[PDB]
Design a protein around this motif. Sequence first.
Motif: not given
Lengths: 309, 309
Positions: A57, A241-243, A9, A238, A235
Amino acid sequence: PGSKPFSVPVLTVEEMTNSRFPIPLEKLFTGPSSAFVVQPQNGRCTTDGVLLGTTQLSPVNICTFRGDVTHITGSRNYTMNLASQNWNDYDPTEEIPAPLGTPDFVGKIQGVLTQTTRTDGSTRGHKATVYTGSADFAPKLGRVQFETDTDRDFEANQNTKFTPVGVIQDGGTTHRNEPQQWVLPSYSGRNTHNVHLAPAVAPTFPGEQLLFFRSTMPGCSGYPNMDLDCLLPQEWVQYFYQEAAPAQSDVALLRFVNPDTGRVLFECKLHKSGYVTVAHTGQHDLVIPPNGYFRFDSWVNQFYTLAPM
Amino acid sequence: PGSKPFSVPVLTVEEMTNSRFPIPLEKLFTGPSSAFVVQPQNGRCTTDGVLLGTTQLSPVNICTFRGDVTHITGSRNYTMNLASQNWNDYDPTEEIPAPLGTPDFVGKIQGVLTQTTRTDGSTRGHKATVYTGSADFAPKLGRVQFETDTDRDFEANQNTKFTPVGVIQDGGTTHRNEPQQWVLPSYSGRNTHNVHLAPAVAPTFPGEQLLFFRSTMPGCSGYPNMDLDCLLPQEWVQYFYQEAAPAQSDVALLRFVNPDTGRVLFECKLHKSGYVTVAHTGQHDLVIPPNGYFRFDSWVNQFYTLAPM
Ligand SMILES: C[C@@H]1O[C@@H](O[C@H]2[C@H](O[C@H]3[C@H](O)[C@@H](O)[C@@H](O)O[C@@H]3CO)O[C@H](CO)[C@H](O)[C@@H]2O)[C@@H](O)[C@H](O)[C@@H]1O
Ligand SMILES: C[C@@H]1O[C@@H](O[C@H]2[C@H](O[C@H]3[C@H](O)[C@@H](O)[C@@H](O)O[C@@H]3CO)O[C@H](CO)[C@H](O)[C@@H]2O)[C@@H](O)[C@H](O)[C@@H]1O
């Protein structure tokens, strides 16, 4: 070949959050770690998004407990029989070291126990401290104890929450010698072995050290060591985990960029198992622009030599 | 045409966090809102990632304060002269209603004030309550007051933090009639006008209501109304900020999917200005699978008729 591009990020350090306690990040720190075992269980995630240890998360759940409380008669102490975070029955059969978000260091964590009586919506809140080095600290078995400022006000068989605030030092320990952020609790109590742990991490390449994402825990009494280092910002957990972008090698080379000059301040290795190293020898507080950020540039190997930090 | 595809995160409700107080989400709720003004300042973000109101990125900072404290002689109350979140001088000149993360409702928020003395690292923590409806609650001007359980222990001219825990009800208010989650504070104090606010939101299409992302704030004393509704999960703020995908129309149609059946439970409109509506009339607690999640399906217009929820 051609797999989903990995990235980190675009968030500054001050925009991010510690993954080991619910407080913002403040700074970056590097130092030698050969005298301790770096094995935190919160803030653990692979670059392709696999959560490890006790990592979950949202940062607000870290070091919180929920359940109901039983008074230890003749004291101001209470045993909490843990619930799940959503107030369901606790399920100890998950292959994890302890409930997700359980504290991963030995120390005296002060906060507030709150309770609501179901029938009438009456509420109460009292100062409470959990000592995660206590022989009876056994979150994996569903039990923790709290020392409070009351011996009468908490009801049995009602939903009760602990919200963490900070840490204390007392009981004749030496100044700044507790908490001990690198000492894991015994999650099932004294003289039981921990299970399903995220592995210890260490720099292995000559001239490298870990890079730590550092906060200062609030202190609530005494002279505590308030330093708290995490291996990954919450972050980043997070985001990965999402990507869930596949790792193309063992190491992602990141550059830390200064927008005020356009130049690279330093580079570092983000290991695919979820930790960061830099080429430096010694303790060093990094001096960064507040708008600085990390940028993924290329997949390299563990044998890549970094520019000195 | 062909702009970066918009999406929402694949996170369940229970995996997400309230954007108005540092606590997990618990449930989805819909009800009529014509009797109040829905104008929260936290949890406000456009779908293309523009933060609004007092919204910032990490949930742990919501309803925290930092600064130094001055004792009101003859009382147990302290005025806090606010600092920036990174302990720098407060800059009131930003075009925002109040520091980012400031409480956006009128109520009595209880938590803990912690302090460290710089010279020796001594620390202290005490119960503290801020009443955000107080005439002197003036965070935009850099001043808030705390009622505490001490009249001597806090030093002047030392870094002091407030960590929020929950809410109380007292002072002869009616049961569950405080906090008032839809009443904005006067950020510069009594009889000053708020500035730079995120706009009020309301359903405008016939048969529609707002969909609220709901938590229960811990209660610390009395009989408070603990319901807390946000317009967007904190993680959606974080995601939109990071993705910054352009809105192709005024409304993103989302379907809420049940993985245990493969079927759609309900659909809703995510308005590009950052709030959600459903086709329903009446108060309703949504009954959802814990593994349910939202999925973006298409850009439609404000004039699209949703399937009844
Ligand atoms: C350091 C103080 O901590 C809290 O006071 C605690 C008190 O600390 C004392 C030290 O133990 C002592 O060595 C010497 O330094 O004086 C301190 C207080 O003057 O210790 C007791 C237990 O012994 C409690 O833990 C107190 O909370 C805080 O309230 C004080 O303001 C200081 O920060
Ligand atoms: C509801 C209780 O709140 C805390 O006690 C508070 C106390 O509440 C009393 C109510 O005011 C009263 O109407 C009646 O219901 O009894 C309650 C206590 O028995 O009110 C005082 C001020 O009047 C304080 O605010 C107390 O904190 C909590 O400690 C109790 O366990 C109840 O939940």
